[PDB]
Structure formats: C-alpha cells, structure tokens
Design a protein around this ligand. Structure first.
Ligand SMILES: Cc1cn([C@H]2C[C@H](N=[N+]=[N-])[C@@H](COP(=O)(O)O)O2)c(=O)[nH]c1=O
Ligand SMILES: Cc1cn([C@H]2C[C@H](N=[N+]=[N-])[C@@H](COP(=O)(O)O)O2)c(=O)[nH]c1=O
Ligand SMILES: Cc1cn([C@H]2C[C@H](N=[N+]=[N-])[C@@H](COP(=O)(O)O)O2)c(=O)[nH]c1=O
Lengths: 190, 200
C-alpha cells in the first residue's frame, strides 16, 4: 500500500508520518518512509531549493519550471519507491505528487480543478511513471493555525488541498488533524 | 578526444558533424557522435522541446529554467559521453555546454562577461561535472542564410531573429576568449579533411 502525507509547511506532516508508521508496525506490518523533496539526494531537488532561496536567476519565477524540478526529483526516486513497495507492506511518503498540484495551482491563483493540477497528473503519473498513491492523507490546517505553527501562497495552497481531497484528485483522500489517533488511522487505511 | 560542434540554428552543424566524422574515419580513427538535446532519451530534453513550442505553461518564459533542463539533460548523459570516449578515438557532439551559455546570455541581452555565461560555466562543468571538450568548434554562418534555412513549425527560439543574431555574437566572444577550453571557428565551406587533420 502506498500512502502520501500531504499538507502545507508546518502542518505537522513529518510527525504524523512517524505516528502512522508506529501504528502500522504495532498492527503487524512493515513500514518504510521517504520524504520529498529529496534534498541532498538529487540535483533537481537541490537546485529547486536554491532557486527558492534566490539562486539561479529567474528560474523560480516560473511555476511550471519549479513544478518540473520537483517532478524530475520524484522521477529519480521511482526505482526506490518500487523497491520499497516490493519489500514493505506500507510505504509512507512525506509529501508526494499532490504537493506539486497544490502549490502550482496556488501560485497561479487556480483551483484544484484547474490546468496546473491537471498537468501534474499527466506529467508525473503517466510520463514519469510515479505510482498513484492508494491513499492521500491531508493533514489539513487553517491559515491561522498554520501561522501559529509566504502566508498568502500558503493559505491558497491550503485551499487547493482541501479541494484536491474533496475531488479525489489522483485517488482516495482522507482529511485528518495532527491529533488524529494513530491506531484508528492505521485501521482506516488498512 | 571530445569535440563539440556549436553554432546558431540552421548554421549547418548536423552536416559538418557528418563530414568531420568521415574525415576522422578515413584517417583511421573510430568516431562516435551524440547530439543535444537528447530528444527521446531524456524527459528533460523532450519537455524542453515541447516548452519551446508553447507547452508546459510558463516554462519557456524562464531563461534559467530552460537552461537548467538542458543542463539536466546533459548531466544524465555523463556516463554515456564517457562510455563513448572509451570505445572510440573521437567523440563528436552536436551542441554541448556552450549552446547553453550562448542562448541563455542572448535571451538576457548579456554578453560573455554576464552572469548567465558564468552560471552555465559553474553548474555544467564544475557542479554537474560534465567532461570539458578538447575542442569547441564554432560553425559561423550568415544570419540571413541561417534564418531562411529554418523558415523553410519553428519554436519560440527559431522565430526570434534577434535572438539568433545575439547568440551568434556571444558565441564569437566565447570562442574568442576560449570559454571552457580551446575553440576553432570555421565557415560552412571548411574542408573536412583539413579540419579533421587540424583537430587530431
Ligand atoms: C518536532 C515537531 C514539530 N512540529 C511542528 C513544527 C512545524 N511547524 C511543523 C512541521 O510541519 P511539516 O512536518 O509539514 O514540515 O510541526 C509538530 O507539530 N510536532 C513535532 O513533534
Ligand atoms: C515536494 C514539493 C514541494 N513543493 C514546494 C513546497 C515548499 N514551498 N516552500 N516554501 C517547497 C519546499 O517544501 P519542503 O519545505 O517540504 O521541502 O517546495 C512543491 O511546490 N512541489 C513539490 O512536489
Ligand atoms: C542543447 C541546447 C539547446 N538549446 C536551444 C537552442 C534551440 N532553440 C533549442 C533546440 O536546439 P536544437 O534545434 O539544436 O535541438 O534549444 C539551448 O539554449 N541550450 C542547449 O544546451
């Protein structure tokens, strides 16, 4: 089973990944995780990060260029993902293909049913061969709550996410809070 | 030996690569050739091509983004360029790192002393560790003649007549200062044998 954990930055994804992993193991299943972007593991991911820090000229000014960088990063992890999927019962990804769909649309002031989100599916899932996640778990957080733990882009990204999940973008979604009961979540995703 | 053929679009590089390839084979030197972008062999390349034809939203509008896809295309070809360099006496590349430096600077109305050229330098050679070619051969040609060759669809770069002229100008500067290594500037009527003899 392939599970993607999605949400805005500061939503609490890294932590929810561990908890959900802990719950699945307690239930007698093996679990491997992988996080994106794979900083330090792929040039695409490292250039994207740098671009976001004001490097590489006008690269960051292009929504589709940034999106492509994050996709090329995932493309280079296909062999890894396929490996984890053959060895472990559950593979949990800290951010996946929907992160590109959500942030790209938000930067373009589009919505989940827009072109950028449609484009992400055609590119990553079919052309690059990234496995479509069985479950996409949205750790939804309001703009207000996120602030506590780029606001406008972040807020709009949160909105695209809420809609992506409601529309079953790329598959079945589940919305949860950071406090969600690990054991109940694992049982629901079994 | 690694030789890179450079020039603007329609300059007639493809041909020169064939002719030079022959001269080398005649002189008893096995030759292999590779062209960039490696269409059909690199998703970065394929996407770059489609982006110049108006696809992938605002991709092509970023000078550095396009340069990056090409740089990433070549990076994923490092092992191959080395595999060729080992199995043949001469490797000929149809466009290489310099293409990226000339076009990127041209798109920015910059010259060889600009940031784009230096940026290309660091990321491709230094960071990505692309093998520096022993020879960079600039195939100079008339801007009028080159443009007509292409008019006879064309992507956003080919339709840009001023881009192609600035690209030629920057190219000449690159070769003139030995950007990235030793260059050789030739005309369309250059004799293959003579050139091959010179290069090797
Ligand atoms: C260490 C830790 C940080 N956080 C916070 C710090 C961040 N704000 C946020 C990290 O969110 P992301 O994992 O999606 O980057 O959660 C938790 O919610 N739980 C934790 O156990
Ligand atoms: C993995 C991923 C991240 N991103 C974004 C969200 C983030 N924006 N900020 N700041 C940025 C870095 O995300 P991380 O903080 O999780 O590394 O890139 C995408 O746009 N698409 C993707 O596929
Ligand atoms: C290989 C390459 C092509 N290009 C450009 C020139 C062209 N416009 C376009 C395609 O060139 P070719 O037609 O030679 O494939 O991309 C660069 O700007 N940098 C590069 O490194």
């Amino acid at each position: 089973m392939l599970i993607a954990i999605e949400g805005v930055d500061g939503a609490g994804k890294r932590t929810l990944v561990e908890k959900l992993s802990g719950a699945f193991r307690a239930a007698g299943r093996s679990v491997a995780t992988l996080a994106f972007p794979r900083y330090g593991q792929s040039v695409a991911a490292d250039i994207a990060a740098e671009a976001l820090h004001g490097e590489h000229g006008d690269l960051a000014s292009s929504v589709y260029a940034m999106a492509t960088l994050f996709a090329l990063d995932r493309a280079g992890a296909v062999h890894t993902i396929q490996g984890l999927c053959r060895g472990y019962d559950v593979v949990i990804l800290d951010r996946y293909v929907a992160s590109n769909a959500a942030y790209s649309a938000a930067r373009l002031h589009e919505n989940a049913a827009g072109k950028a989100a449609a484009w992400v599916q055609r590119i990553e899932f079919a052309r690059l061969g990234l496995p479509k996640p069985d479950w996409q778990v949205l750790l939804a957080v309001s703009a207000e709550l996120a602030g506590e733990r780029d606001a406008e882009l972040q807020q709009r990204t949160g909105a695209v996410y809420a809609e992506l999940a409601a529309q079953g973008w790329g598959g079945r979604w589940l919305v949860v809070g950071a406090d969600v009961d690990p054991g109940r979540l694992a049982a629901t995703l079994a």
